[PDB]
Amino acid sequence: GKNLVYSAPTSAGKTLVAELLILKRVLEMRKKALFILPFVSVAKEKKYYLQSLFQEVGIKVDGYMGSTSPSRHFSSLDIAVCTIERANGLINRLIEENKMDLLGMVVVDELHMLGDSHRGYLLELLLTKICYITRKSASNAVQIVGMSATLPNLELVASWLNAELYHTDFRPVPLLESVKVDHVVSLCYETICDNHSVLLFCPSKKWCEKLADIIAREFYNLHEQKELLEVMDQLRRLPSGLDSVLQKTVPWGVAFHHAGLTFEERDIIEGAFRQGLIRVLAATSTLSSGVNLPARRVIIRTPIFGGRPLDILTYKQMVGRAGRKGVDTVGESILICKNSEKSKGIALLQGSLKPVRSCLVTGSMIRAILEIIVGGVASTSQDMHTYAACTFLAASGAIEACVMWLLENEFIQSTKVYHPTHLGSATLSSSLSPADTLDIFADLQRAMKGFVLENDLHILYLVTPMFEDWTTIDWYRFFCLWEKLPTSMKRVAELVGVEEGFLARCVKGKVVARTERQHRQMAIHKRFFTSLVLLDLISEVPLREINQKYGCNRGQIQSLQQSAAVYAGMITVFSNRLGWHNMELLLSQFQKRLTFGIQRELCDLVRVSLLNAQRARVLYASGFHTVADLARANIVEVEVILKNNMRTIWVTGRKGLTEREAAALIVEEARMIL
Amino acid sequence: GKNLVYSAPTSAGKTLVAELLILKRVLEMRKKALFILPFVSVAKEKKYYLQSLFQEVGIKVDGYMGSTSPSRHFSSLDIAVCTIERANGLINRLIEENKMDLLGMVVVDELHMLGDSHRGYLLELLLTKICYITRKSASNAVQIVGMSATLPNLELVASWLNAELYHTDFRPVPLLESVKVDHVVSLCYETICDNHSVLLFCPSKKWCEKLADIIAREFYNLHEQKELLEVMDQLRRLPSGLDSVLQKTVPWGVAFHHAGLTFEERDIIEGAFRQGLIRVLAATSTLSSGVNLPARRVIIRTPIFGGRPLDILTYKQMVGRAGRKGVDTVGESILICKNSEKSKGIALLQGSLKPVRSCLVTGSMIRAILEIIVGGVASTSQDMHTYAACTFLAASGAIEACVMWLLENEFIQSTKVYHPTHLGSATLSSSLSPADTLDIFADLQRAMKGFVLENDLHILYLVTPMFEDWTTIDWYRFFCLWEKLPTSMKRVAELVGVEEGFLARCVKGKVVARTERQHRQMAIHKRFFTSLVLLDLISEVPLREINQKYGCNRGQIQSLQQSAAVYAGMITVFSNRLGWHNMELLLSQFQKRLTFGIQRELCDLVRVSLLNAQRARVLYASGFHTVADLARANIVEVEVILKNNMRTIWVTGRKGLTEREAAALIVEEARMIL
Ligand SMILES: COc1cnc(Cl)cc1-c1cnccc1C(=O)Nc1nnc([C@H]2C[C@@H]2c2ccc(C#N)cc2)s1
Numbered sequence A, B: 001g002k003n004l005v006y007s008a009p010t011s012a013g014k015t016l017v018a019e020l021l022i023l024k025r026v027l028e029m030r031k032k033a034l035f036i037l038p039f040v041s042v043a044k045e046k047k048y049y050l051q052s053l054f055q056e057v058g059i060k061v062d063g064y065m066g067s068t069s070p071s072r073h074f075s076s077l078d079i080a081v082c083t084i085e086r087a088n089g090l091i092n093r094l095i096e097e098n099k100m101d102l103l104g105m106v107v108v109d110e111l112h113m114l115g116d117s118h119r120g121y122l123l124e125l126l127l128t129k130i131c132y133i134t135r136k137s138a139s140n141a142v143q144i145v146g147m148s149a150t151l152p153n154l155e156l157v158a159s160w161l162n163a164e165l166y167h168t169d170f171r172p173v174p175l176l177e178s179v180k181v182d183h184v185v186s187l188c189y190e191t192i193c194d195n196h197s198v199l200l201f202c203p204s205k206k207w208c209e210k211l212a213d214i215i216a217r218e219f220y221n222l223h224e225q226k227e228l229l230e231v232m233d234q235l236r237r238l239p240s241g242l243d244s245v246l247q248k249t250v251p252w253g254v255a256f257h258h259a260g261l262t263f264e265e266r267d268i269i270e271g272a273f274r275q276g277l278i279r280v281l282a283a284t285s286t287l288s289s290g291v292n293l294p295a296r297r298v299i300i301r302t303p304i305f306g307g308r309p310l311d312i313l314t315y316k317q318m319v320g321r322a323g324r325k326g327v328d329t330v331g332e333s334i335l336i337c338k339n340s341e342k343s344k345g346i347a348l349l350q351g352s353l354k355p356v357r358s359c360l361v362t363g364s365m366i367r368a369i370l371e372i373i374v375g376g377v378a379s380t381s382q383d384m385h386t387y388a389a390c391t392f393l394a395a396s397g398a399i400e401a402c403v404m405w406l407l408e409n410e411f412i413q414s415t416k417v418y419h420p421t422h423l424g425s426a427t428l429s430s431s432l433s434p435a436d437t438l439d440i441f442a443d444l445q446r447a448m449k450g451f452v453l454e455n456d457l458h459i460l461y462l463v464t465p466m467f468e469d470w471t472t473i474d475w476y477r478f479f480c481l482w483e484k485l486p487t488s489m490k491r492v493a494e495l496v497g498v499e500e501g502f503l504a505r506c507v508k509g510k511v512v513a514r515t516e517r518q519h520r521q522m523a524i525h526k527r528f529f530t531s532l533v534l535l536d537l538i539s540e541v542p543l544r545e546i547n548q549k550y551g552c553n554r555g556q557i558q559s560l561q562q563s564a565a566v567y568a569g570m571i572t573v574f575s576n577r578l579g580w581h582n583m584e585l586l587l588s589q590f591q592k593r594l595t596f597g598i599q600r601e602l603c604d605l606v607r608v609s610l611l612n613a614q615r616a617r618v619l620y621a622s623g624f625h626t627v628a629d630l631a632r633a634n635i636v637e638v639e640v641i642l643k644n645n646m647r648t649i650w651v652t653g654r655k656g657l658t659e660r661e662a663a664a665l666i667v668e669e670a671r672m673i674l
């Protein structure tokens, strides 16, 4: 357990070494092993992969990613395939419970995210806690394994982690980069005729869709079917349904992939392309760091991405998806350029990725100091300075400025030992940023004074996150909804801070500039709009209805789903620890309702992993109002309900599943839950 | 009327030419003459001087200074001896009423205040408006006159104003300067033996009082009585009474003068020193720019003033008070120094005053743009650039940044042509700073939603100014008062924003740092404390009771009186112009109540200038519940009531007035009011 850090290009079986190491460590030490992943989609896919590969050895595999969580305690688990943000909370609770020795290893995937990123600092703190605790309390304590592409400072990361080094540039499908700048239809025909797929990357969502549409149009003009019809039917029966453009585009071996779609539609398209059913796929920058989806020929619409040169890291991870290891011999990554874009393309062709930064007065150092002090691992000044040396910023005097910020905001109490009073303890357990915890504390305390129980809107407003701009708000439609709102919802609107004057300013006048820090009251109205969307969401209204009523597309609504559910869980833990029992009770149900977008009655029924929001309503309408009830039922009954050999349903990480055996597994999983 | 600018040292009749100029202009053109003064005390003194000197020519002389105002329209007036703040409002209302030609002269006193100062910018804008309006609409339009000490750039100011120049350093009592190295006992003894006064200047207040006390003690130990006893009795019968230290210090020809005293006590001491009854006077930096109070020998405790070298302009105006024109031969100024202070003293001995700045993104330019736009004198962009050239900053591109700031805050509406909608018109007529008018608008609009009429506290909170730190707040006593507050007062406290949590933080914990702009909620609690003080003030409780209950001394309470009354008047005009009739009605009575610190019943009775807060209660208790009633009464009745040849009462600008003839003037003035 001397730790380890290694890098290798993707599409080269580079995760296999991690699988072997984790198997060895869990089987030998009988201790846990966190598998940290950047994104929730890749975390889900890796969790399914590890479940399949380690089911036959009595190894439990269930991670903490997104808003979801395992239905069993952390003790029973053996491998937790968590995301970066939730792995930090896992380690924090282990430290606070003084059960740190339960961990045997911590694998980290795609370590290049350590640098410039809005989540890498969480990875930095997460690994710093491990190194600090290992060195304070000791050969075979906690192994760390990392992955990345060709990092200019990989050896530096290994030195920080006190781990070995392995860097190699090898792939079974040698890529051939060749820039080139009529013959468009000829190129399309010659690439498609070879029986090989094409993965095109386009920055703009609308232009990506139109490009896929016109590729399908050219194929239709110049012009397996059963499996493609199966994919048609699978797309048809979805909560959002089938898109008009996608319907015409899919049956000519052309598809598109962007955040605008739902997670389920993205899964359908990814599976269709991976199986080879889809030949041409116009994806966007989102897929670049997404699930493993190799192709034969990669193409890029243009270096320009969002009014700027494309990130070199994005290009590096894009090229990895050009070549299939096992069926393909060679792979290509073509990059069209223009006269003015020739220089940008040439610059992008050469040069590896930029160095890894740290991103640490900054809120990250406040979070770090809070973690260490509340955890009880750095209580006095003498040792908190060693934590600075433990970090990657050091290995590559702001602590005092942060420590005072915490005492200024009463997060901790000085004694010269330090301790948390109540808000620091509740802030670390909730995994909330200490910067926003003061605002959350004020909003919760204000809410409990005059809480509105007539509807869920006041509860939703308090579990509505607004740390990112999840969508652009149309203030005219928002004013229409406001004037159409019931009075019960308007009482909470007045309570929170919404004013008809501000909406009147925004409906006609240009969006008011928030030049001054005092204009956080612009965030109040955006928060109220988002909370109304979330109320329509948990009311179980179709995504299309929420789209027309509010203008946010289904992909944005699903991202809001996940963010709101995660925030609701965090706020529930915050309230639980703060001693606010009534607030905790009112908030508890909302995490699951937000995760699944379901009513209170379906909450006891979505405990079965194989039950969507629609598949929970159909069973509830039939009479299965509880998982125990759903266990006591024959397979043919559920089969006929689902209907009212062909794979038509879809579930995350599915197999040759149809309406027949899907009903068989629904009842079987219900039995296991009981 | 070719304007004029001149400078000359004080104690040389520099103001004399002003009186002749005003007399000539007012008698010839029959137009008005605004005499602008820096401070309210000097404005009062000059108003009384001009009244005495021009009563025998049938000319009205009543100025707008402090919270007070004439009891007759501006039309009937001939000379308005206003202060800088209120002269700007006079000019603004003249411009808005398009009656600018009514003015014939604008004399300005102590023009060096135009530079670095928290009020000089108002003088700058006031003078800029006159020159702009004269040049757009024409050589007898409006004459301008100025005064100051030896300004390094007097010619520059004259060039800005397009006026002549006269600068001379002459004084009938030549001041000497020859350093000869506390050692004040013999110096004071030899000076007092010569039958000459001494004016000592001390930076600190408590140490100034102790310095007066020790000098009185040495005079008592080592070393007219009827007039000094008269001054004793005059000090005895005051709302604040007589200080313990002042009682023991006054009868040995020693007194002290600082902002801690009341305006009345300051007036008593100044009169006693001017008459020669007081020989030694320990004043502070406040008196340096105060009323004319010449002395034979000036002394300064130390160049260090407030932890820094004494301002050179302050020293220049101090030394002017060393020499009496007509009874003195040669005046002296002695500046004691030390080993470390020798360098500072020699530095301060040499070098005249610094050059005059302009102090013009800045709120001053926002105010200027607002004034010119709603005045209708600068509507289109083309001419607003000329205003910039008209300024003293120019004569010695931020307009666009300010113009957008006004449109950003909806102060004006764009059309090529700019106009005010409602808030700009109400802001300029209210003479409020447009920076704070947004907060005032928010607080007023919020108040009308949930107004509390049970007591005056909610009305006082809205007319409580907090633009300066009028006193240091003791949060322990404030918490005690909060505990003892009635529920009616606590409802308004909750409405405004006061929270028991913040007071709990402040009572024991150190004063919370307002590092963040979002912590204006510290100003809410200071505002509430000040409003409670103001409520006790208008409840007609003695100043000593307010001092013990709140800790603010009587001088601070009187400064708060004046500031709160001025702010109440401004807010009343703001509400009047905004169309808020109920708010205006509730606010109207409060300006006079704050000015005099009286109840509603005495408001109709303090219309007589001779009547004070105490002298209005004694008559009201007798039965004179109205000025008309007070007119219908014999002189002996009021004489006996006042009692229940010796000058015992005091009133601003008094004469050989006693209890007998004071009653005679009270009834006589009441008749004139009717
Ligand atoms: C408490 O914050 C959350 C609550 N809800 C959700 Cl949906 C998401 C979050 C969240 C949001 N943003 C960042 C991080 C988190 C997060 O940290 N989430 C966690 N999920 N599971 C955790 C461990 C609690 C379990 C535990 C119990 C015993 C032992 C032992 N021995 C070890 C671990 S923490």
Ligand SMILES: COc1cnc(Cl)cc1-c1cnccc1C(=O)Nc1nnc([C@H]2C[C@@H]2c2ccc(C#N)cc2)s1
Binding pocket: B064, B066, B067, B068, B069, B074, B075, B085, B086, B087, B088, B089, B090, B093, B094, B097, B099, B102, B429, B430, B431, B565, B566, B567, B568, B569, B570, B573, B591
């Ligand atoms: C409206 O602001 C105030 C109200 N209350 C008070 Cl106690 C003080 C103020 C104040 C505070 N800080 C700065 C300036 C002011 C201020 O502007 N004070 C004034 N008070 N009266 C004035 C003349 C307005 C009237 C007028 C002028 C010309 C003609 C003609 N022809 C007719 C009427 S201006």
